[PDB]
Write a protein that holds these residues in place. Structure first.
Motif, PDB file in Angstrom:
ATOM      1  N   UNK A 150       0.830  -1.207   0.000  1.00 62.25           N
ATOM      2  CA  UNK A 150       0.000   0.000   0.000  1.00 62.25           C
ATOM      3  C   UNK A 150       0.863   1.254   0.000  1.00 62.25           C
ATOM      4  N   UNK A 151       0.260   2.349  -0.458  1.00 64.11           N
ATOM      5  CA  UNK A 151       0.878   3.665  -0.512  1.00 64.11           C
ATOM      6  C   UNK A 151      -0.135   4.667   0.050  1.00 64.11           C
ATOM      7  N   UNK A 152       0.314   5.553   0.936  1.00 65.74           N
ATOM      8  CA  UNK A 152      -0.514   6.655   1.434  1.00 65.74           C
ATOM      9  C   UNK A 152       0.272   7.960   1.452  1.00 65.74           C
ATOM     10  N   UNK A 153      -0.439   9.080   1.379  1.00 63.40           N
ATOM     11  CA  UNK A 153       0.185  10.404   1.324  1.00 63.40           C
ATOM     12  C   UNK A 153       0.412  10.976   2.711  1.00 63.40           C
ATOM     13  N   UNK A 154      -0.126  10.312   3.722  1.00 63.09           N
ATOM     14  CA  UNK A 154       0.012  10.786   5.094  1.00 63.09           C
ATOM     15  C   UNK A 154      -0.311   9.675   6.073  1.00 63.09           C
TER      16      UNK A 154
END
Ligand code: NDP
Ligand code: 1QZ
Length: 186
Positions: free
Chosen positions: A88-92
Motif C-alpha cells: 500500500x501507498x498513502x500520502x500521510x
C-alpha cells in the motif's frame, strides 16, 4: 485503530541512519527484536501493518522486501503508486490509518507499527491517543545523517519494566544497548 506503536534504534547522539543504512554494524538480536515486535499478531488470521517512509523502504535490502509476515505500507507525497513489492501507498499517516478501515483491510490488520524514518516518527509521536514507543538506546555515539526527534516527557512516560521486553543492558559485538518502552495515553 485504537493504538499505535513506534519502534526505533538510536545512538547516544540521536542518530538513526547514515548513508541509507544504519550507523552501527548489524546487531543480530536487536534485529530479531525488531522482527518479533513488528511481526507478532495477537489475532490468528490478521497481520500487523508496518508504516514507513520512502527512504526507509529503499534502505531495506531488496531481497527482504516486503517485510515478511507483515502488511507493508509506504508513505510518500510524490509517488503515485506503491513501490514495487509494497502492499500500500498513502500520502500521510492519517490516510494510512483510515485505509485500515476500508474494505480491503477491514479485518486483516492487528497492530500498527511505525518503523521510520525521522518525519514519520515525528508525526506518529504527535498522533492523538494511545501510543507506545519501543526505543533501543545504543549506548555509543555513531556518525549519522538521520536523527530521532527528542522524546517529550510532558507527554510520554518511560515505563520501568515492561512485559516481553528485557530490562538489562544487552551487548552485541561490543556494543551495549538497552530496550526502552515509552507510553502516552492521550
Ligand atoms: N535506526 C532505526 O531504527 C531506523 C533507521 N532508519 C534509517 O534512516 C534513514 C531513512 O530515514 P529518513 O532519511 O528519515 O527517510 P524516510 O524513510 O522517512 O523517507 C523520507 C520520505 O518519506 C516520505 N515521507 C516521510 N515522512 C512522511 C510523512 N510523515 N508523510 C508523508 N510522507 C512522508 C517522503 O517521501 P516523498 O519525497 O516521496 O514525498 C520523504 O521524502 C536510513 O538511513 C535508514 O537506514 C530508518 C528507520 C529506522
Ligand atoms: C535497526 C533495526 C531496527 N531496530 C529497531 N529497534 N527499530 C527499527 N526500526 C529498526 C529498523 C529498521 C529499518 C530501517 C530496517 C533496516 C534494515 O536494514 C537491513 C532492515 C530491516 C528489516 C526488517 C525486518 C525484516 C528484514 C529482513 N531482511 C532485511 C531487513 C529487514 C529494517
Amino acid at each position: 485503530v485504537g493504538s499505535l506503536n513506534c519502534i526505533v534504534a538510536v545512538s547516544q547522539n540521536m542518530g538513526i541512519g547514515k548513508n541509507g543504512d544504519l550507523p552501527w554494524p548489524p546487531l543480530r538480536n536487536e534485529f530479531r527484536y525488531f522482527q518479533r515486535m513488528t511481526t507478532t499478531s495477537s489475532v490468528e488470521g490478521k497481520q500487523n501493518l508496518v508504516i514507513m517512509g520512502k527512504k526507509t523502504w529503499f534502505s531495506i535490502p531488496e531481497k527482504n522486501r516486503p517485510l515478511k509476515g507483515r502488511i507493508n505500507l509506504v508513505l510518500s507525497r510524490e509517488l503515485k503508486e506503491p513501490p514495487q513489492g509494497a502492499h500500500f501507498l498513502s500520502r500521510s499517516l492519517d490516510d494510512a490509518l483510515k485505509l485500515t478501515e476500508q474494505p480491503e483491510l477491514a479485518n486483516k490488520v492487528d497492530m500498527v507499527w511505525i518503523v521510520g524514518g525521522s518525519s514519520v516518527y515525528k508525526e506518529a509521536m504527535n498522533h492523538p491517543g494511545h501510543l507506545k514507543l519501543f526505543v533501543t538506546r545504543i549506548m555509543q555515539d555513531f556518525e549519522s545523517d538521520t536523527f530521532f526527534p527528542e522524546i517529550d516527557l510532558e507527554k510520554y512516560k518511560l515505563l520501568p519494566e515492561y512485559p516481553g521486553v528485557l530490562s538489562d543492558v544487552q551487548e552485541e559485538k561490543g556494543i551495549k544497548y538497552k530496550f526502552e518502552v515509552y507510553e502516552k495515553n492521550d
